[PDB]
mmCIF file of all heavy atoms in Angstrom:
data_model
loop_
_atom_site.group_PDB
_atom_site.id
_atom_site.type_symbol
_atom_site.label_atom_id
_atom_site.label_comp_id
_atom_site.label_asym_id
_atom_site.label_seq_id
_atom_site.Cartn_x
_atom_site.Cartn_y
_atom_site.Cartn_z
ATOM 1 N N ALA A 1 7.335 1.424 -21.972
ATOM 2 C CA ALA A 1 7.520 0.072 -21.535
ATOM 3 C C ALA A 1 6.651 -0.244 -20.303
ATOM 4 O O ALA A 1 6.880 -1.261 -19.656
ATOM 5 C CB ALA A 1 8.998 -0.129 -21.157
ATOM 6 N N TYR A 2 5.632 0.553 -20.015
ATOM 7 C CA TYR A 2 4.754 0.309 -18.864
ATOM 8 C C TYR A 2 3.275 0.406 -19.129
ATOM 9 O O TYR A 2 2.490 0.034 -18.267
ATOM 10 C CB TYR A 2 5.159 1.239 -17.738
ATOM 11 C CG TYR A 2 6.468 0.988 -17.114
ATOM 12 C CD1 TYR A 2 7.593 1.677 -17.509
ATOM 13 C CD2 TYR A 2 6.675 -0.026 -16.124
ATOM 14 C CE1 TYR A 2 8.874 1.462 -16.955
ATOM 15 C CE2 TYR A 2 7.881 -0.294 -15.601
ATOM 16 C CZ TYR A 2 8.993 0.441 -16.040
ATOM 17 O OH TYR A 2 10.212 0.250 -15.480
ATOM 18 N N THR A 3 2.855 0.941 -20.339
ATOM 19 C CA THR A 3 1.472 1.147 -20.657
ATOM 20 C C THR A 3 1.143 0.497 -21.933
ATOM 21 O O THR A 3 1.987 0.292 -22.802
ATOM 22 C CB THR A 3 1.178 2.692 -20.675
ATOM 23 O OG1 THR A 3 -0.250 2.886 -20.810
ATOM 24 C CG2 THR A 3 1.862 3.315 -21.857
ATOM 25 N N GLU A 4 -0.176 0.222 -22.134
ATOM 26 C CA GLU A 4 -0.656 -0.394 -23.299
ATOM 27 C C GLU A 4 -0.471 0.590 -24.542
ATOM 28 O O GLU A 4 -0.822 1.766 -24.445
ATOM 29 C CB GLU A 4 -2.070 -0.839 -23.178
ATOM 30 C CG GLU A 4 -2.440 -1.363 -21.814
ATOM 31 C CD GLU A 4 -3.864 -1.748 -21.656
ATOM 32 O OE1 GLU A 4 -4.661 -1.445 -22.609
ATOM 33 O OE2 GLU A 4 -4.251 -2.384 -20.677
ATOM 34 N N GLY A 5 -0.017 0.052 -25.635
ATOM 35 C CA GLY A 5 0.199 0.849 -26.844
ATOM 36 C C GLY A 5 -1.053 1.295 -27.463
ATOM 37 O O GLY A 5 -1.139 2.475 -27.876
ATOM 38 N N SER A 6 -2.095 0.469 -27.574
ATOM 39 C CA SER A 6 -3.333 0.792 -28.225
ATOM 40 C C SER A 6 -4.099 1.927 -27.481
ATOM 41 O O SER A 6 -4.286 2.985 -28.064
ATOM 42 C CB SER A 6 -4.248 -0.450 -28.324
ATOM 43 O OG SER A 6 -5.540 -0.076 -28.755
ATOM 44 N N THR A 7 -4.468 1.710 -26.255
ATOM 45 C CA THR A 7 -5.303 2.711 -25.489
ATOM 46 C C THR A 7 -4.362 3.701 -24.843
ATOM 47 O O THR A 7 -4.461 4.889 -25.146
ATOM 48 C CB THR A 7 -6.111 2.009 -24.449
ATOM 49 O OG1 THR A 7 -5.379 1.052 -23.752
ATOM 50 C CG2 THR A 7 -7.335 1.279 -25.131
ATOM 51 N N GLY A 8 -3.456 3.221 -24.001
ATOM 52 C CA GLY A 8 -2.594 4.199 -23.241
ATOM 53 C C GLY A 8 -2.822 4.106 -21.750
ATOM 54 O O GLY A 8 -2.283 4.871 -21.005
ATOM 55 N N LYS A 9 -3.725 3.203 -21.349
ATOM 56 C CA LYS A 9 -4.044 3.007 -19.917
ATOM 57 C C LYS A 9 -2.790 2.682 -19.142
ATOM 58 O O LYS A 9 -2.172 1.631 -19.337
ATOM 59 C CB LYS A 9 -5.087 1.940 -19.754
ATOM 60 C CG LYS A 9 -5.737 1.895 -18.362
ATOM 61 C CD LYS A 9 -6.169 0.521 -18.030
ATOM 62 C CE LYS A 9 -7.203 -0.063 -18.956
ATOM 63 N NZ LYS A 9 -7.161 -1.549 -19.037
ATOM 64 N N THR A 10 -2.421 3.554 -18.203
ATOM 65 C CA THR A 10 -1.187 3.382 -17.375
ATOM 66 C C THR A 10 -1.557 2.557 -16.110
ATOM 67 O O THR A 10 -2.725 2.199 -15.915
ATOM 68 C CB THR A 10 -0.600 4.657 -16.979
ATOM 69 O OG1 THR A 10 0.677 4.431 -16.382
ATOM 70 C CG2 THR A 10 -1.482 5.461 -16.001
ATOM 71 N N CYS A 11 -0.526 2.266 -15.291
ATOM 72 C CA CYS A 11 -0.747 1.483 -14.113
ATOM 73 C C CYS A 11 -1.607 2.262 -13.097
ATOM 74 O O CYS A 11 -2.486 1.664 -12.472
ATOM 75 C CB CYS A 11 0.557 1.125 -13.501
ATOM 76 S SG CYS A 11 1.570 2.558 -12.921
ATOM 77 N N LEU A 12 -1.405 3.580 -12.941
ATOM 78 C CA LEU A 12 -2.167 4.398 -12.024
ATOM 79 C C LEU A 12 -3.628 4.396 -12.457
ATOM 80 O O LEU A 12 -4.516 4.147 -11.576
ATOM 81 C CB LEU A 12 -1.667 5.811 -12.051
ATOM 82 C CG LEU A 12 -0.373 6.068 -11.286
ATOM 83 C CD1 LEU A 12 0.845 6.010 -12.224
ATOM 84 C CD2 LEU A 12 -0.385 7.431 -10.619
ATOM 85 N N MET A 13 -3.988 4.575 -13.710
ATOM 86 C CA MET A 13 -5.339 4.518 -14.166
ATOM 87 C C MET A 13 -6.019 3.175 -13.912
ATOM 88 O O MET A 13 -7.015 3.155 -13.272
ATOM 89 C CB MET A 13 -5.403 4.846 -15.667
ATOM 90 C CG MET A 13 -5.205 6.326 -16.011
ATOM 91 S SD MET A 13 -4.655 6.594 -17.679
ATOM 92 C CE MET A 13 -5.971 5.841 -18.607
ATOM 93 N N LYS A 14 -5.346 2.102 -14.268
ATOM 94 C CA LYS A 14 -5.827 0.762 -14.032
ATOM 95 C C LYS A 14 -6.088 0.553 -12.592
ATOM 96 O O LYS A 14 -7.005 -0.218 -12.249
ATOM 97 C CB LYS A 14 -4.969 -0.308 -14.726
ATOM 98 C CG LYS A 14 -5.552 -1.646 -14.757
ATOM 99 C CD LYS A 14 -4.808 -2.558 -15.697
ATOM 100 C CE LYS A 14 -5.441 -3.861 -15.910
ATOM 101 N NZ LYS A 14 -4.790 -4.764 -16.916
ATOM 102 N N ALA A 15 -5.252 1.114 -11.761
ATOM 103 C CA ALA A 15 -5.510 1.042 -10.280
ATOM 104 C C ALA A 15 -6.806 1.788 -9.950
ATOM 105 O O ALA A 15 -7.582 1.374 -9.107
ATOM 106 C CB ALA A 15 -4.312 1.631 -9.538
ATOM 107 N N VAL A 16 -7.044 2.968 -10.632
ATOM 108 C CA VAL A 16 -8.179 3.787 -10.269
ATOM 109 C C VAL A 16 -9.478 3.125 -10.806
ATOM 110 O O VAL A 16 -10.543 3.322 -10.243
ATOM 111 C CB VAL A 16 -7.998 5.261 -10.791
ATOM 112 C CG1 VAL A 16 -9.193 6.090 -10.410
ATOM 113 C CG2 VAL A 16 -6.681 5.814 -10.203
ATOM 114 N N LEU A 17 -9.377 2.395 -11.891
ATOM 115 C CA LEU A 17 -10.581 1.761 -12.509
ATOM 116 C C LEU A 17 -11.220 0.741 -11.491
ATOM 117 O O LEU A 17 -12.359 0.405 -11.647
ATOM 118 C CB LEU A 17 -10.261 1.014 -13.798
ATOM 119 C CG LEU A 17 -10.383 1.801 -15.121
ATOM 120 C CD1 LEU A 17 -9.247 2.823 -15.276
ATOM 121 C CD2 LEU A 17 -10.398 0.801 -16.300
ATOM 122 N N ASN A 18 -10.478 0.261 -10.506
ATOM 123 C CA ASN A 18 -11.111 -0.689 -9.572
ATOM 124 C C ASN A 18 -10.692 -0.394 -8.126
ATOM 125 O O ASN A 18 -9.534 -0.381 -7.785
ATOM 126 C CB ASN A 18 -10.672 -2.139 -9.908
ATOM 127 C CG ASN A 18 -9.169 -2.284 -10.150
ATOM 128 O OD1 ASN A 18 -8.436 -1.305 -10.064
ATOM 129 N ND2 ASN A 18 -8.764 -3.427 -10.547
ATOM 130 N N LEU A 19 -11.691 -0.125 -7.328
ATOM 131 C CA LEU A 19 -11.526 0.085 -5.823
ATOM 132 C C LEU A 19 -12.554 -0.800 -5.161
ATOM 133 O O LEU A 19 -13.751 -0.718 -5.420
ATOM 134 C CB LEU A 19 -11.730 1.560 -5.474
ATOM 135 C CG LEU A 19 -10.557 2.477 -5.680
ATOM 136 C CD1 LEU A 19 -10.304 2.842 -7.130
ATOM 137 C CD2 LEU A 19 -10.691 3.792 -4.872
ATOM 138 N N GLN A 20 -12.054 -1.639 -4.208
ATOM 139 C CA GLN A 20 -12.938 -2.635 -3.614
ATOM 140 C C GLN A 20 -14.023 -1.957 -2.742
ATOM 141 O O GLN A 20 -15.170 -2.444 -2.772
ATOM 142 C CB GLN A 20 -12.091 -3.628 -2.785
ATOM 143 C CG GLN A 20 -11.358 -3.021 -1.595
ATOM 144 C CD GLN A 20 -9.965 -2.489 -2.030
ATOM 145 O OE1 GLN A 20 -9.664 -2.287 -3.160
ATOM 146 N NE2 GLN A 20 -9.093 -2.312 -0.980
ATOM 147 N N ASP A 21 -13.677 -0.933 -1.957
ATOM 148 C CA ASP A 21 -14.646 -0.281 -1.150
ATOM 149 C C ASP A 21 -14.416 1.210 -1.249
ATOM 150 O O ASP A 21 -14.425 2.003 -0.305
ATOM 151 C CB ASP A 21 -14.499 -0.771 0.317
ATOM 152 C CG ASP A 21 -15.624 -0.280 1.156
ATOM 153 O OD1 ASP A 21 -16.756 -0.238 0.759
ATOM 154 O OD2 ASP A 21 -15.317 0.157 2.293
ATOM 155 N N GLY A 22 -14.103 1.723 -2.422
ATOM 156 C CA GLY A 22 -13.717 3.087 -2.622
ATOM 157 C C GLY A 22 -12.404 3.434 -1.958
ATOM 158 O O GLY A 22 -12.158 4.582 -1.632
ATOM 159 N N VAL A 23 -11.556 2.424 -1.753
ATOM 160 C CA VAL A 23 -10.257 2.597 -1.101
ATOM 161 C C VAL A 23 -9.254 1.688 -1.755
ATOM 162 O O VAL A 23 -9.580 0.476 -2.000
ATOM 163 C CB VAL A 23 -10.410 2.444 0.393
ATOM 164 C CG1 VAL A 23 -10.584 1.004 0.785
ATOM 165 C CG2 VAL A 23 -9.175 3.000 1.127
ATOM 166 N N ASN A 24 -8.073 2.203 -2.114
ATOM 167 C CA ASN A 24 -7.018 1.400 -2.641
ATOM 168 C C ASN A 24 -5.724 1.794 -1.926
ATOM 169 O O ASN A 24 -5.321 2.907 -1.930
ATOM 170 C CB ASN A 24 -6.845 1.582 -4.143
ATOM 171 C CG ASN A 24 -7.702 0.664 -4.963
ATOM 172 O OD1 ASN A 24 -8.654 0.044 -4.459
ATOM 173 N ND2 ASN A 24 -7.397 0.548 -6.261
ATOM 174 N N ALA A 25 -5.123 0.842 -1.226
ATOM 175 C CA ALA A 25 -3.794 1.026 -0.590
ATOM 176 C C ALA A 25 -2.633 0.969 -1.573
ATOM 177 O O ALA A 25 -1.519 1.303 -1.181
ATOM 178 C CB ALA A 25 -3.590 -0.002 0.504
ATOM 179 N N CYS A 26 -2.877 0.642 -2.799
ATOM 180 C CA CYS A 26 -1.858 0.550 -3.822
ATOM 181 C C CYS A 26 -1.643 1.808 -4.584
ATOM 182 O O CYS A 26 -0.650 1.957 -5.331
ATOM 183 C CB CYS A 26 -2.063 -0.646 -4.775
ATOM 184 S SG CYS A 26 -3.309 -0.271 -6.045
ATOM 185 N N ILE A 27 -2.559 2.770 -4.568
ATOM 186 C CA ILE A 27 -2.455 3.976 -5.331
ATOM 187 C C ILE A 27 -1.222 4.743 -4.827
ATOM 188 O O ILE A 27 -0.434 5.340 -5.570
ATOM 189 C CB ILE A 27 -3.760 4.832 -5.238
ATOM 190 C CG1 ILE A 27 -4.885 4.034 -5.945
ATOM 191 C CG2 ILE A 27 -3.538 6.164 -5.865
ATOM 192 C CD1 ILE A 27 -6.224 4.706 -5.767
ATOM 193 N N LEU A 28 -1.087 4.885 -3.480
ATOM 194 C CA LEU A 28 0.008 5.659 -2.877
ATOM 195 C C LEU A 28 1.392 5.145 -3.254
ATOM 196 O O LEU A 28 2.140 5.939 -3.877
ATOM 197 C CB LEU A 28 -0.108 5.689 -1.389
ATOM 198 C CG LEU A 28 -1.112 6.501 -0.633
ATOM 199 C CD1 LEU A 28 -2.449 5.992 -0.781
ATOM 200 C CD2 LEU A 28 -0.732 6.594 0.888
ATOM 201 N N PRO A 29 1.762 3.873 -3.152
ATOM 202 C CA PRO A 29 3.092 3.367 -3.417
ATOM 203 C C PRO A 29 3.596 3.763 -4.816
ATOM 204 O O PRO A 29 4.721 4.172 -5.008
ATOM 205 C CB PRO A 29 3.086 1.910 -3.209
ATOM 206 C CG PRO A 29 1.964 1.717 -2.207
ATOM 207 C CD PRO A 29 0.983 2.752 -2.576
ATOM 208 N N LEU A 30 2.714 3.582 -5.846
ATOM 209 C CA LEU A 30 3.024 4.025 -7.172
ATOM 210 C C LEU A 30 3.314 5.557 -7.191
ATOM 211 O O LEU A 30 4.227 6.050 -7.875
ATOM 212 C CB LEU A 30 1.877 3.729 -8.118
ATOM 213 C CG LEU A 30 1.677 2.247 -8.331
ATOM 214 C CD1 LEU A 30 0.329 2.035 -9.110
ATOM 215 C CD2 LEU A 30 2.819 1.598 -9.109
ATOM 216 N N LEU A 31 2.589 6.280 -6.400
ATOM 217 C CA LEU A 31 2.780 7.769 -6.382
ATOM 218 C C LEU A 31 4.154 8.106 -5.790
ATOM 219 O O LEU A 31 4.877 8.972 -6.365
ATOM 220 C CB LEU A 31 1.707 8.445 -5.626
ATOM 221 C CG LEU A 31 0.315 8.498 -6.287
ATOM 222 C CD1 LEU A 31 -0.764 8.545 -5.255
ATOM 223 C CD2 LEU A 31 0.251 9.728 -7.214
ATOM 224 N N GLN A 32 4.585 7.560 -4.660
ATOM 225 C CA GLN A 32 5.879 7.965 -4.170
ATOM 226 C C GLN A 32 7.024 7.282 -4.929
ATOM 227 O O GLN A 32 8.134 7.871 -4.957
ATOM 228 C CB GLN A 32 6.085 7.784 -2.665
ATOM 229 C CG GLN A 32 6.198 6.358 -2.125
ATOM 230 C CD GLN A 32 4.885 5.714 -1.721
ATOM 231 O OE1 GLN A 32 3.838 6.264 -2.072
ATOM 232 N NE2 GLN A 32 4.926 4.644 -1.010
ATOM 233 N N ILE A 33 6.810 6.163 -5.578
ATOM 234 C CA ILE A 33 7.905 5.587 -6.364
ATOM 235 C C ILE A 33 7.990 6.280 -7.721
ATOM 236 O O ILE A 33 9.004 6.037 -8.393
ATOM 237 C CB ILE A 33 7.794 4.071 -6.518
ATOM 238 C CG1 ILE A 33 6.551 3.689 -7.407
ATOM 239 C CG2 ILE A 33 7.756 3.373 -5.180
ATOM 240 C CD1 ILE A 33 6.454 2.247 -7.691
ATOM 241 N N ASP A 34 7.016 6.991 -8.144
ATOM 242 C CA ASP A 34 7.047 7.714 -9.395
ATOM 243 C C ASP A 34 7.475 9.170 -9.301
ATOM 244 O O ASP A 34 7.897 9.795 -10.211
ATOM 245 C CB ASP A 34 5.704 7.627 -10.120
ATOM 246 C CG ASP A 34 5.875 7.942 -11.644
ATOM 247 O OD1 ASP A 34 6.968 7.792 -12.145
ATOM 248 O OD2 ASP A 34 4.792 8.210 -12.291
ATOM 249 N N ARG A 35 7.328 9.727 -8.059
ATOM 250 C CA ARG A 35 7.723 11.135 -7.805
ATOM 251 C C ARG A 35 9.185 11.323 -7.427
ATOM 252 O O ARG A 35 9.691 12.438 -7.314
ATOM 253 C CB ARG A 35 6.872 11.725 -6.697
ATOM 254 C CG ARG A 35 7.060 11.091 -5.325
ATOM 255 C CD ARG A 35 6.626 12.039 -4.195
ATOM 256 N NE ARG A 35 6.360 11.354 -2.985
ATOM 257 C CZ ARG A 35 7.272 11.304 -1.958
ATOM 258 N NH1 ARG A 35 8.417 11.886 -2.039
ATOM 259 N NH2 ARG A 35 6.908 10.583 -0.852
ATOM 260 N N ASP A 36 9.912 10.166 -7.219
ATOM 261 C CA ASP A 36 11.358 10.235 -6.970
ATOM 262 C C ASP A 36 12.201 10.037 -8.187
ATOM 263 O O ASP A 36 13.363 10.341 -8.188
ATOM 264 C CB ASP A 36 11.750 9.195 -5.872
ATOM 265 C CG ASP A 36 11.221 7.841 -6.172
ATOM 266 O OD1 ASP A 36 11.153 7.407 -7.326
ATOM 267 O OD2 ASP A 36 10.850 7.151 -5.106
ATOM 268 N N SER A 37 11.627 9.480 -9.271
ATOM 269 C CA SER A 37 12.318 9.208 -10.527
ATOM 270 C C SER A 37 11.592 9.624 -11.754
ATOM 271 O O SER A 37 12.030 9.319 -12.882
ATOM 272 C CB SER A 37 12.643 7.748 -10.639
ATOM 273 O OG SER A 37 11.477 6.942 -10.689
ATOM 274 N N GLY A 38 10.407 10.374 -11.594
ATOM 275 C CA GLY A 38 9.652 10.723 -12.759
ATOM 276 C C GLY A 38 10.349 11.760 -13.626
ATOM 277 O O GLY A 38 11.140 12.561 -13.152
ATOM 278 N N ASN A 39 10.016 11.716 -14.894
ATOM 279 C CA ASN A 39 10.583 12.648 -15.879
ATOM 280 C C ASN A 39 9.410 13.659 -15.788
ATOM 281 O O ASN A 39 8.425 13.305 -15.066
ATOM 282 C CB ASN A 39 10.771 11.854 -17.223
ATOM 283 C CG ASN A 39 11.599 12.594 -18.299
ATOM 284 O OD1 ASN A 39 12.079 13.681 -18.120
ATOM 285 N ND2 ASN A 39 11.765 11.887 -19.420
ATOM 286 N N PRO A 40 9.386 14.831 -16.409
ATOM 287 C CA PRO A 40 8.519 15.882 -15.868
ATOM 288 C C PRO A 40 7.103 15.554 -15.757
ATOM 289 O O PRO A 40 6.339 16.169 -14.961
ATOM 290 C CB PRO A 40 8.732 17.077 -16.839
ATOM 291 C CG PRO A 40 9.902 16.705 -17.703
ATOM 292 C CD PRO A 40 9.846 15.266 -17.753
ATOM 293 N N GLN A 41 6.649 14.516 -16.456
ATOM 294 C CA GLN A 41 5.231 14.032 -16.346
ATOM 295 C C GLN A 41 5.177 12.924 -15.252
ATOM 296 O O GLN A 41 5.941 11.966 -15.352
ATOM 297 C CB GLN A 41 4.720 13.456 -17.702
ATOM 298 C CG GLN A 41 5.494 12.205 -18.227
ATOM 299 C CD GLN A 41 6.764 12.565 -18.965
ATOM 300 O OE1 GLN A 41 7.303 13.683 -18.863
ATOM 301 N NE2 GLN A 41 7.215 11.582 -19.739
#
């Protein structure tokens, strides 16, 4: 319910595909909000 069915590009990947100056402040929040409720992946 969070990634495209055809390709499989997740939110983290789509975040990594674009960095304005080689820096993204949004990569981290996804990381800590996914490590407190993630299933083993």
Side-chain angles (χ1 to χ4, degrees):
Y2 292 97
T3 188
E4 321 179 351
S6 172
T7 46
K9 193 212 298 155
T10 189
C11 64
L12 286 91
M13 284 156 60
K14 191 164 185 174
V16 181
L17 271 72
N18 48 3
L19 279 73
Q20 63 272 18
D21 188 45
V23 73
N24 273 14
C26 80
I27 296 172
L28 283 72
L30 294 169
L31 286 152
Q32 70 269 14
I33 67 175
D34 200 18
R35 65 158 161 101
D36 49 37
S37 62
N39 192 0
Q41 66 276 17

